[PDB]
Design a binder for this molecule. Sequence first.
Ligand SMILES: [Mg+2]
Ligand SMILES: [Mg+2]
Ligand SMILES: [Mg+2]
Ligand SMILES: [Mg+2]
Ligand SMILES: [Mg+2]
Ligand SMILES: [Mg+2]
Ligand SMILES: [Mg+2]
Lengths: 76, 295, 199, 132, 128, 23
Amino acid sequence: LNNIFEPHVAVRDAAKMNIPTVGIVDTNCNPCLITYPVPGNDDSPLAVHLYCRLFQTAITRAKEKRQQVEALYRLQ
Amino acid sequence: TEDFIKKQIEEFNIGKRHLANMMGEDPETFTQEDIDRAIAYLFPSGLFEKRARPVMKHRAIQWGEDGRPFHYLFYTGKQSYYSLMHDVYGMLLNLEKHQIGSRWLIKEELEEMLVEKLSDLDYMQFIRLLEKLLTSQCGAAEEEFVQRFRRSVKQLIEPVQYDEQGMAFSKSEGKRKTAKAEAIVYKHGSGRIKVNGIDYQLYFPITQDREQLMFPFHFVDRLGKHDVTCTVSGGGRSAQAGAIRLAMAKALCSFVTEDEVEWMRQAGLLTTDPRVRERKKPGQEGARRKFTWKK
Amino acid sequence: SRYSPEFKDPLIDKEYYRKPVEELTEEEKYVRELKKTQLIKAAPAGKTSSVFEDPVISKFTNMMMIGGNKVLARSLMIQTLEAVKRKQFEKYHAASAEEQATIERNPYTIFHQALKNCEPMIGLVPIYQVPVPLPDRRRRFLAMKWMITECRDKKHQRTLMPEKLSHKLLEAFHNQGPVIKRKHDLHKMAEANRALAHY
Amino acid sequence: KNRAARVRVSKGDKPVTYEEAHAPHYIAHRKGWLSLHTGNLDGEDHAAERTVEDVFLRKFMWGTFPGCLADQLVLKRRGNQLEICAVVLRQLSPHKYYFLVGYSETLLSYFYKCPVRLHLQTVPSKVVYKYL
Amino acid sequence: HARLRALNGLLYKALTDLLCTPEVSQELYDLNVELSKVSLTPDFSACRAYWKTTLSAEQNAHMEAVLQRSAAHMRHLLMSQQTLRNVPPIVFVQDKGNAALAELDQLLAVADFDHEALNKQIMEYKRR
Amino acid sequence: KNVLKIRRRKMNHHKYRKLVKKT
RNA sequence: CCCCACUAUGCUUAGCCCUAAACCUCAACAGUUAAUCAACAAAACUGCUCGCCAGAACACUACGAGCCACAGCUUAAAACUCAAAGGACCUGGCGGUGCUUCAUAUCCCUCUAGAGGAGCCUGUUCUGUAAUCGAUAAACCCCGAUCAACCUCACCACCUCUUGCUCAGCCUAUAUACCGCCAUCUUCAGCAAACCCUGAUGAAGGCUACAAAGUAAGCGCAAGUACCCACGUAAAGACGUUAGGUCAAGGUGUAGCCCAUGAGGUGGCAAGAAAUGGGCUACAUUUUCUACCCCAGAAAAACGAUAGCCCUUAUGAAACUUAAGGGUCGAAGGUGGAUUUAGC
Ligand SMILES: [Mg+2]
Ligand SMILES: [Mg+2]
Ligand SMILES: [Mg+2]
Ligand SMILES: [Mg+2]
Ligand SMILES: [Mg+2]
Ligand SMILES: [Mg+2]
Ligand SMILES: [Mg+2]
C-alpha cells in the first residue's frame, strides 16, 4: 500500500510487464495481482525486520549455493 | 560502452605522442597544459566562446554486459541523489543513537557533484537534511561531509618605496569614467598636492573637486601629514577629481593601519566606481530615452 | 545599476569608526563584523566627510541644479548663504544690544529653521481631493520645492537668484512670506475638505 | 521575429550542419567567417572586389559540383594565392572529381589572374550537427 | 438606479439587524462589527458590505477573518428571513475612510494658520 | 433535463385557453 | 414591484369538482450479492404478474363517448410536414461581473524634463498640378531615403526606337500565391515531438514533496558570449497572433503588354486655404555679450529667426530651387487648455 492506503502502482505495473511479485499483504491489502502473497502484519517493526532477515537469508543462501554448484561443476 | 571510451583513450594517447613529437617536447612530461598550448598555437581560433575553440582532451552506463545494474538504488532513477540521502540519514541515525563565510552549494553545484538532474524540492529536502545534520552536534566525521557541500563566500596594499631624494613613498593608481590617474604619496609631507606639476588649488578651481581630494586624508585624519604628486589624463574635472581621490586613497592605504584601511573601504574610498557612460542604442534618443511615442 | 545587489551604500561618518569597542553592543559588533565581508559602493562625489557638509543644503543645491550645472547651483547656494549672513550682520550692527541678543547670524541655522517653518504638516491627494498626511521626506521635499518655485517666479524682475532666495529665506525665518502663505492656504483647504476627507 | 539566416525547428527531423544550426549573432562566437581576406581590415582597400570575387566563386563552385558540396566553401587568400576548401560527398566518381578540380582550377586562375587551388575533403554524407 | 438603491438600503438594514445579535455566532457578536454602507453590483452578482475597521491592526484582521468565515452563513440567514428572495454572495470590505478623517482631525489640531453642435454641420452644408 | 418539452406543453395550453376564451 | 384599505378565498356545515413536478420522477410480490456496470441518477440483477410504450410535431388537440362536470375532466385521433426529435456526458470559452493581491519608469498619484501656445524645420493628409508609388491605431507619419537641382526616377508632356545591353524586356496586376527581411504581443515562458498510464481501451484525463502516473528529447527562456566585473546594457527572445508590411531590394508562382504597360532623349512639378505628427530655436536674469574655460567686466524691454530680402563663397556643366558666410531686417513670442511623451 502507498501512503494514501491505495495499492502500490508498482503492483499493477509489474503485472502489466509480467514480473512475478512476492508481497506481504496485511488485512487491508489486495492480494489479487500478487503472484506469491504472504498474509502477514506489515506495520510492526518486528514483523518487517523478520521479513527482511528471511528474504536476505534466502537470497544469500541461493547465491552461495549457486556459487557452490558452479564451482562443483567446474571441478567435474 | 566502456570499449568505446577505452578506444578513445588509446587514440588520445597516440595523438598526444604525435603532438609531443610535432612540438619537439618530451613525450613523457607532455602534460595537459602543454597539449592545450600546442593546440592553441597550431589551430589559432579567436571564437569568443571558449567551448567552441579546438580542444584535445581525455557520462557512463550503470549496468554491465549481463544487464545487472551496479548500484542497488539504480531503479529509483536518481541513484546518486538517493544514495547520498541514504548515507546522510544513516549518519543522522548514528548521531541520534550515540546521543561565517560558508554557504550551501546551489542546486546547479549539487547536480554537477551528483552528475544527475534534481528538482527544487529534492534540493530543499537535501539542504534541510544537511542542516539537521549540522544542528545535531555532528562530529568531525560528519563535519567534513558537510564541508564537502560548503562553499566559501581584503584589499591588497602596495608596499612603501624609496626615491633618489631619500623620501619614503607609496604609489598607486585609479580610474573614474574615462579618466585615469596615478598618485604618489610620501610618508612625510606638508599637505602639498601637485596635479600634473600644477598645484591642486590652481588645477581644480571648482571647490567640489578640492573637497573630493580632501576627503581621503580628512577621513583618516591626515590633513597636512603627506605630500602628493598626481598625474591624471582623460575625462572631465569631476572624473579627474574622482580618479585622483581613488588613487590617493589606495596609495595612502600603505601608511594607515589595517583598521583605517577597513574603515576607508567601508567608506567607499577604495571601491572603483563602475558607473560609466551607457552606450546609445538604435531606435531611441539616448541610452534610455526612447523617441516620442506617436499615436 | 552597474552595482550588484551585494553592494552596500557607504557610511561616511568618522564618529562611527571612532566609537570604542567597549561601547559597541552585541548587535552593533555583529553589524561591524558583517560589514567587513560586504562589498561597499564607491563614495559618491556629492557627500564627503567634511565637517561643513550639510545634507540638507546639498539636497537643496541638487534641486536647484538645472541641466547638470552643479557648479552654478553651488555658486547660487553659497551666494545665498553669504547674502543671508551679510543681511543678518547688517541688522545686528544696526540694532541695540537687547535686539542684538535675539538676532540670529548663523546662515545654516536660518536656512534650516526656514525650511522647517515651511514644512506642510498635511497635504491633499485624489482618492475628491482628500486631505492626507504626508511623510517627513515628502514634507521636506514640498518645503524645498515650494521655496525654489517661489524664488523662480517671474513676479521678480532682473533680481538675481541669490538675493531673491535670501529674501524669501529671511521672510520664512520670521513666519512670513509667500511660501508660509502657501502652506497656510494648503492647511485651510485641508480644513475645508475635512468633510470629504472620509473617503 | 528574426528570420535572417536561421533554421526554424518544426518536428526535430530536419538535419542541419554546424553552419546552418547557428544564427548570425554567433559568427564572432561559434562559427568563424567562411572567407578570410584582408580587404575588410582597417586601412585596407579592394573590399568590394574581394566580395564580388567571393560571391562569384561560391556560385560557380556550387554549379560546377552539382549535388556534391556537402557544406559551404571556405575561401582563403594569401598574397595573390587563392585557396578554395570544399567538403564534398563521395557520390561522384574520382575521375570526374579530378577532371572538375583541374578544369575549375585552370579556369578560375585564368579568369581572376591568380594561382587558384582547390582542396576537396570527402565525407560519406552531409555531417549532421543536430536535428530541427 | 432606484431599485438598486432600495435594495442597498434594505440589505444594509437587514445586515445591521443581523450583527446586533449573537444569531450568526457568539464571536461575531462579541466583535461588535459596524457597517458604513452596502453596495450591490450592477449585475446583482455580489453584495459588498463596507465594515468600519478599528485602529488595531490585529483586531482588524481578526474581525475581517471572522466576517469572511461567516459571510455564507449570513447569506443563508438573510435568505431564510425572506428579506430578499435571491441574495447574491456577501463580501465584507474593510472601510478605512474614517481613519483618514480622524488623522486629519488629529493633525489639524496642531496645524498653524446637442442641437448647436449639429447646427454647425447644417450651416456648413447650407453654405457648401 | 431541459424543460423544452414542458415549455412547448405550456405554450400549447396557453394558446388553447386563449382560443377557447376568444370563441 | 413597494405602501395602505378591502373582497372572493384560506375556516365551519352540506354537497360538488377529481386536477398537481399527485415525484423516492425508480409498479406490486418473491429472491440473490454470484461472476459490477452505456452515461447520469438511488449499486447490479433474477423470477413472476399487471399496466403502459413503438420517430418528432400536429396533440394535456379535434371528433365520438362518459361525468352534479358547461371557458371543465377523463379517454384520444387523423391529414398536411420534417430527417430528425430526444437522453446523459466531454471539451468549452469569450462576461464595460466583483473581491484580495499586484505592476516599479509602471495602471494612477507622487519626481524631472518635455509635447499640446509662437516661429522655423520636416513628414503626412487635404487643395491644386499634366505630373510617381509604397507606409496608414497601438505596430504610419526626419517612414523606404545612412537623403530628390539634372541623374536619382519608377511621374507628366512632347519627340524618337523595334529581336531591342540580355538565347529580350516590363517599377504591369496579385504581399489574399511566396521566398527573402521584418513588425507586433515579446518590457512574454511557454511551445513541444516521442512514449507511458487512467477512464470497462467513449468525446477525454494524467495534480499532491511526510508526494497519489507521468517521463520527456528538442526549441525558447536560462546558460554561455560581446562591451567595463559576477552588475548593467546589448545581443538573444520559441510556437503562435494580426490573410500585419514589403511583387518598388532582389528572386519567383499566376495573369497581362510585345509598333509598347518595353527602350531612349529633351523639358517640367514639389504650391498653400488648411489640418496633423515629430524636431530645432526660444520666450531670458540659474539669462545675454566678451575674455576665460569656471574668483571677471558689461548688458538687461532688451531677450528672441537656422525666417524674409540682398550679396559673396563652396560644390557642380547647370544654384532660381543646395549648403556656408556676411549685410540687412528684430517679427511672432512672454512658460502654453483638456490631454500627452520619456526616464530608476
Ligand atoms: Mg498494515
Ligand atoms: Mg407530494
Ligand atoms: Mg400494480
Ligand atoms: Mg391537464
Ligand atoms: Mg380536452
Ligand atoms: Mg367533445
Ligand atoms: Mg504634383
